[PDB]
Structure formats: structure tokens, C-alpha cells
Structure 1
Amino acid sequence: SVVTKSIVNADAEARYLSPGELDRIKNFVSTGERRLRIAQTLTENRERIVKQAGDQLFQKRPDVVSPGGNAYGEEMTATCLRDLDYYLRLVTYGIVAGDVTPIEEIGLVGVREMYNSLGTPIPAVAEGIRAMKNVACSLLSAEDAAEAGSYFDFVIGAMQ
């Protein structure tokens, strides 16, 4: 959260939180009820949001799901989707926190090092998360979609 990000910064200058910081954690706790609503809605449709988003990807990148590409046979493909559900879960986290750190520490610090070892295309993964951002955003209001949108863009942008 920002509560956590403020304390840290403040302890670095060895001082009590500045009024401005408090003004922030104040107006951030007031945004809570909503935040949780957004996470709750994505987590009730997590099942579908991943499936079609899963198809939308395999259509744009048939090399992923045919002979010679990473996700091949129900075997490999089944896990590819798994990877995608992993990230949806991390999105609801960032959202509830009002921060992106949870995503960073849980599934961003060395995504490339990991995937390169497995020989899976990262740009392909990036399109897999993009697709999701659209399936999920379709279930949200005009605003609950803009904000929830950030957390999806931050990921894809690191996938490069």
C-alpha cells in the first residue's frame, strides 16, 4: 500500500510521516470499499476471464499451441493457462493494495530469467495478459476499469 511505502520513505529521513503522506493514506483508505469490489468481481469471473482470454491468445499466436511451440498438447497448454491465472491473482493483489509491489515481488523479479530457461516466448505471454485485461475490464464500470487497467499494463510492460 501507500501506508507501507510512506513509512519506509519516512524512516529513511528519520521522521514522523509528513502531513502530505498522511493526507494520502487518508484518501487511500477511503477508496478501499471500491477497490475490494473490483477485486471481488474479477475473482468471481476468474474462471471465464482466463478461458476466452486463453482462446483469444491461441488465435493470435497459433505457433504457441502447435508443433514446436511451448504450449503443446493438453499437457503444456494446460500449464500455460495456469500461468495466466497466476497473474490474474496477482492483479487482484495489486488492486487491493493500491500498489504494484506485490506483483513485482511475487511474479516480476526475474520473470525473464525463468521463462528463458523454459524457452517460452515472453512477448507471447504479454499478449496473454493483455487479452485478460480486456475480458476482465468488460465486467467493470467505466472507472473501475481504468484503474484496474493500470495493473494489467504494468505487467505486460515488464514482459519485454
Structure 2
Amino acid sequence: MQDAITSVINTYDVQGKYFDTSAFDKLKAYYATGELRVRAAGTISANAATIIKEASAKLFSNQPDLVRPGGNAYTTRRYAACVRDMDYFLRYATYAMLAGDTSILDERVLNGLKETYNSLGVPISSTVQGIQAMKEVTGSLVGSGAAKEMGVYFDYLSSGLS
């Protein structure tokens, strides 16, 4: 993949230059944010199953059609598929947050997801609602400073699906 440090390295490699003051400033910014990123990553790893539980419960309470007969999440199979997708979203958002770049979200998750959902019949609106549910659930757990950092990656996933 690519993260913030590798991003600076790659741009200066393509330009074929040694590091300047701007590159060191970017690297210092990443080093400043890294400890908060690690705390948030550990928090989310601890509470992954919980976060998925409340986020799915909130989504299925706001949109009860999904779980009821005739809904896309109505089956043990389809419900488990929804929970699996939400777990993937949370894990890769955590990877992107800890990395400081959204490239892993583009490659591993977003490149192909819209077409997959459109072929499967998954409602993309409800999926964006589920991602927003995970965002607001995890914000209370990671803390305001870490919530601000995690929100951009949840927004990235939501915008990629939309």
C-alpha cells in the first residue's frame, strides 16, 4: 500500500530530490499524530465486535426493513454477510487511520465495491448509513481527538460508496 511517510518518499523519488524543509515538516506532522493513531488503533482493536454490534443495531433500528422479510439483510446468510462487510469496513478504516493515508481504502475496498453492490442488489444508501453508524459509534469510544481522525476515513468510505 502507501502511507504518509511512503507518500512523501514517493513524491520526492519521482521528483528525484533529497528531502527539503516541507518534507520534514510533513514527516514531523505524521510523527506528532502517530501516538494518537496508535492509541485509537488499540482502542478499536479491543472493541471491534462491540462497535460492529451497536452500529448494526442502530442501522437496523433506523431502517427496520432490512432485517424484516423482503429486506436485503433478511436471512441468516445475508445478515452475516452484512456484518462481515461492516467488519471489513472497520478494519480497513483502522488500517487507513493508523497509516495516515486512504490508499488502502481505494485499493482493497473501494475499487470494485460499487459494481459488486449494484450487481448483488445491496442498497448503497443503507450501506453508507451503516458506515456513518460505525463512525458515530466509534467516535465515542476513541475520544474526540481520535474521533476527528477516524471520521475522515469513515467519510472517505462513505464518499467512495456514494
**TM superposition shift of 1:114:** 1.1
TM-score (norm 1): 0.93
Runs of 4+ in 1 over 4 A off after TM superposition: none
Q: Determine the structure 2 residue equivalent to 1:128.
A: 130
Q: Which runs of 5+ in 1 are unaligned?
A: none
Q: Deviations over 1:131-155 (max 9, x none)?
A: 0111111112221211121111111
Q: Deviations over 1:93-146 (max 9, x none)?
A: 011111111111110112101111111011111111110111111112221211
Q: Determine the structure 2 residue equivalent to 1:71.
A: 73
CA RMSD of aligned residues (A): 1.3
**TM superposition shift of 1:47:** 0.8
Identity %: 41
Query: How many correspondences in the alignment?
Result: 160
Q: Determine the structure 2 residue equivalent to 1:149.
A: 151
Partner AA of 2:141 in structure 1: L
TM-score (norm 2): 0.92
Q: Determine the structure 1 residue equivalent to 2:61.
A: 59
**TM superposition shift of 1:35:** 0.7
Q: How does 1:108-127 map to 2 (within 5 A)?
A: 108-127=110-129
Q: Which has the higher contact order (CA 8 A, sep 6+)?
A: 2
Aligned to 1:49, the other structure's residue is in SS state: helix
Distance 1:140 1:42 in 2: 7
Moved more, 34-43 or 68-77: 68-77
Aligned to 1:64, the other structure's residue is in SS state: coil
Distance 2:102 2:154 in 1: 10
Distance 2:150 2:144 in 1: 10
Q: Determine the structure 2 residue equivalent to 1:26.
A: 28
Partner AA of 1:49 in structure 2: I
Aligned to 2:142, the other structure's residue is in SS state: coil
Q: Determine the structure 1 residue equivalent to 2:87.
A: 85
